[PDB]
Structures are given as C-alpha cells and as structure tokens.
Paper text:
Inorganic pyrophosphatase (PPase) catalyses the hydrolysis reaction of inorganic pyrophosphate (PPi) to two inorganic phosphates (Pi) and plays an essential role for living organisms. We previously reported the expression and purification of family II PPase from the psychrophilic Shewanella sp. AS-11 (Sh-PPase) isolated from shellfish living in the Southern Ocean (Antarctic Ocean). Sh-PPase activated by Mn2+ ions (Mn-Sh-PPase) displayed the highest activity at 5 °C, which is characteristic of cold-adapted enzymes. X-ray crystallography and EPR spectroscopy were used to investigate a cold-adapted family II Sh-PPase from a psychrophilic bacterium that lives in the Southern Ocean.
In contrast, Sh-PPase activated by Mg2+ ions (Mg-Sh-PPase) has much lower catalytic activity with PPi or PNP than Mn-Sh-PPase13, and we obtained well-diffracted crystals of Mg-Sh-PPase in the presence of PNP and sodium fluoride. X-ray diffraction data at 1.3 Å resolution were obtained. The electron density unambiguously showed that the PNP and four Mg2+ atoms were bound to the di-metal centre of Sh-PPase. In the crystal structure of Mg-Sh-PPase with PNP, the bridged water between Mg2+ ions at M1 and M2 is assumed to be replaced by a fluoride ion. An anomalous difference Fourier map indicated that M1 and M2 metal sites in the crystal structure of Mg-Sh-PPase contain a small fraction of metals other than Mg2+. Based on the anomalous scattering factor of these elements (f ″ = 0.24 for S; f ″ = 1.6 for Fe) at an X-ray wavelength of 1.0 Å, M1 and M2 were occupied by Fe with an estimated content of 15% and 7%, respectively. The M1 site was converted to the 6-coordinated slight rhombic octahedral geometry by binding of PNP, and the M2 site was changed to a nearly axial octahedral coordination sphere. In addition, a bridged water in the crystal structure of Mg-Sh-PPase with PNP, as well as Bs-PPase, shows the formation of unique tri-metal coordination sphere, where it is bound with 3 metal ions (M1, M2 and M4). In fact, the crystal structure of Mg-Sh-PPase with PNP displayed a shorter distance between M1/M2 and the bridged fluoride ion. The overall structure consisted of N- and C-terminal domains, and the overall conformation was changed from the ‘open’ to ‘closed’ state by the binding of substrate, as occurs with other family II PPases.
Numbering used by the authors: 2 to 307
The structure:
Amino acid sequence: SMYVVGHKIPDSDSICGAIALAYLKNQIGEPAIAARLGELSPETAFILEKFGFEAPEYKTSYAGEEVYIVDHSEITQAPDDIAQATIVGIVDHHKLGDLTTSTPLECWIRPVGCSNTVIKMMYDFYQVKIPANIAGIMMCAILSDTVIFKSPTCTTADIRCVEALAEIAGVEDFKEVGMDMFKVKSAVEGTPARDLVMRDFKDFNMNGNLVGIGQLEVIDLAVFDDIKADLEADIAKLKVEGNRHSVLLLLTDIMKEGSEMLVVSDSADLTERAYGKPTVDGRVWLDGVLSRKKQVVPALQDAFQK
Ligand SMILES: [Ca+2]
Ligand SMILES: [F-]
Ligand SMILES: [Mg+2]
Ligand SMILES: [Mg+2]
Ligand SMILES: [Mg+2]
Ligand SMILES: [Mg+2]
Ligand SMILES: [Mg+2]
C-alpha cells in the first residue's frame, strides 16, 4: 500500500485528509494506508471522536515506501527519510516547496482554503461516493482551515464543498460545528508553554534560514495574558534548540480577525521589513491576519530571498 500522510505536527486537514484520500484510493483499487507523523491536537481528536474514527497509524520512517503527501510540499514538514521514499502524489493548497522527485507523480494543488476541498474534487473526478462519516471529517477540516469561512484563504469552492459535505454527513448547522472546533482550540488552561508553542508549529527553509512559526487560534486573545511571558521565554529556547534564524508565534483571535505575533529573530527589523510593522519588545499586532500560508509566509519568504 501507499501511505497517505500530511505534515509534521499534523492538524485536522492533514489527519482527515489522509483518512479521506486513503479511502478514495482503496475504492479505486489503489491500495492505501492513512498515516500520521505526530499526535493529534485536541481539535482533531474532537473531530475524529464525533464521526467515529480512530487516529491513523503513527509512522515516521517511509524509506522504500510510496507516499502520497497531503497539505504541504516542504522537506521540513515531510518525513525525515522522504528522499529514500517515492512520492507518488501531492494534494495541497500551499506554496510550492522544496520537495522533489526523480519520477513523474500526481499533484492536485489548488490555491483554496483546505486540502480536503481538493480531495472532494478528487472524489468527484473518480465518481466515488463519499460516506457520511468521511464527509463529516472532511467538512470539519474545511471549517477549521477556513476559520468558519473568515480566513482570506476561503474560496467559493470551499463554501460549496462544506455545504455539499454537510448534507452528506447529516449536519444542518455546520457553522456551529465550526465554532465548536474553535472553542476546543481555545481550551488552553494548564497547558505547558512548550506544548502550546508546538501545537500548530511549522519549520520553513527561507533561502537557507530556518524559520519556525507557531499559531494558536482562539476565540479570545485574553486567554494568553497570564502565560504570554512564558511563551516568549519558550520561543527563545526553541530558537536555540533548533539553531533557527527566527521563531514566530501567532496568537490569533478569530473574532477580532487579527494576530499578535511574538518574535525572536537574528534580524532585529524582521517584521518592519516583511510587513511594514515593527516589533516593539518582540511583539507586533497584525490587524486582519488569520492565515499563515497567505498573510505571514509569503512576505517573510520574499524578505529572505532579497
Ligand atoms: Ca520543488
Ligand atoms: F491544514
Ligand atoms: Mg495543515
Ligand atoms: Mg491545510
Ligand atoms: Mg490546517
Ligand atoms: Mg493552519
Ligand atoms: Mg486544539
């Protein structure tokens, strides 16, 4: 079987998309196994419990295997031994990263709100029925990635996909399922700083500079008031531990629709140069910023390339 696997530090799109695409591949006679590179977030556990799924197989070494990548195209987010695997496919909605192959492959990459929107397009292409349970987790993944349609990554395709999947899944009030997921994400009391920094964290190679970016999407920024200094101390430790150029942590309020970014960087003017918004003692408020892939990464990557 091929293994279908999303990014390191998987989120709901990576987990649910691996399950949904493995099902589709098996239905079309292409043996597949869904896998994961890490533990589930509370949000993803909530989604899988709601629709009756077990977590996919936890698997970290893929040398000699065929792999269908979900929800990224980056060396830093792939299995460590992906160069000794064969990538047979990528389904994604990110920038084109530094993965490569030696062989022809499939890529279903679209600049939409969720990888699961593209996986639904694959089900449509093959004319395979989406079971109710699979539809539910796909629906949840799109509601999560699009921030209940608030994110600027959201497209008409994502909305139409949620509407179609919600009908299949038997969900009438899908926006309340969306809000439920963000209430789960907001339940951060008593969680160690490092577990919050790493909950939704990605490394990026930006012109040979290693940049770590975490994100914590919540309903109310004030949940971070007491732990903010602990988060700041922790990102400085994480910077050193991984010999990173920069570590950024987005504290994202989905109701204000903006983010406070905590910054530790070898570049004193990083956010001034990237966004035209200077940090002050390592913090900057980024009005309107919800999306890492659309509103955070591009300007940073371009600033490192220049
Ligand atoms: Ca490439
Ligand atoms: F995702
Ligand atoms: Mg993801
Ligand atoms: Mg995604
Ligand atoms: Mg996501
Ligand atoms: Mg995300
Ligand atoms: Mg969570």
